[PDB]
Amino acid sequence: KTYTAKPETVQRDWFVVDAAGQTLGRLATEIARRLRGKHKPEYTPHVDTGDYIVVINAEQVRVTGAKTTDKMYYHHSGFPGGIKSINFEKLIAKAPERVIETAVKGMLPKNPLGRDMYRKLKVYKGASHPHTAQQPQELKI
């Protein structure tokens, strides 16, 4: 019968991404492919096999056309009349690391695996990460 992966025998790696002019949703579709594990031959859906990602410049990211002065990010507070909105340009000066997380979070399953695949994503707005001990390799510059 066909082989399934085992969670105590899984091997995981450390990648680092530079986002310095990458288009937002074309960058983010290749992170979310490699967090789920479609690049490995031993992929089963019910276990998590995938590589930790570190993203280093989450403020250099680029969007196309007139979308910088548009693209409201709506969310509701719970109270009556509590709808709130903030566009792309004003958001990126407030918290730059939450643009690129909410784009990847919507390209994942909504399971308790999706919450577990989302913990392998680690973004930074700086230029260096506190993970030199794990020694991530570069991919796809």
């Binding site: 066909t2 082989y3 479609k38 690049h39 490995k40 031959p41 031993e42 992929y43 089963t44 859906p45």
Partner: protein, 117 residues
């Protein structure tokens, strides 16, 4: 000849409550609920004999696809590569050779590239 039906009714009740054990709460112990959960759990077991064949075929394909990109193709150009030639191999035993016998898989992939498709 009065017949009293108290003994052949009981055998047909215990035959239901044997198939319906392991269930939650009142579906495994009282009969007017455990008859519904035996019929419903037989319809699901009829549909899912067909859906078993679809959940593995979609699992074999996504394992060939991952293994054949690492050598330098897609999935869809590989299948046209093997059927330019005549290799005649299922999805079930390609996705065995993708995981376990990885060197024999690479000797297959190079022959699809030589088939140039």
């Amino acid at each position: 000849a009065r017949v009293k039906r108290g003994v052949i009714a009981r055998r047909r009740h215990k035959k239901i409550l044997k198939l319906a054990k392991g269930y939650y709460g009142a579906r495994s112990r009282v009969f007017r609920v455990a008859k519904q959960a035996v019929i419903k759990a037989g319809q699901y077991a009829y549909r899912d004999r067909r859906q078993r064949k679809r959940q593995f075929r979609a699992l074999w394909i996504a394992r060939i696809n991952a293994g054949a990109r690492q050598n330098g193709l897609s999935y869809s150009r590989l299948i046209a590569g093997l059927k330019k030639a005549a290799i005649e191999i299922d999805r079930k035993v390609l996705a065995d050779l993708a995981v376990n016998e990885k060197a024999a898989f690479t000797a297959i992939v190079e022959k699809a590239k030589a088939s140039l498709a």
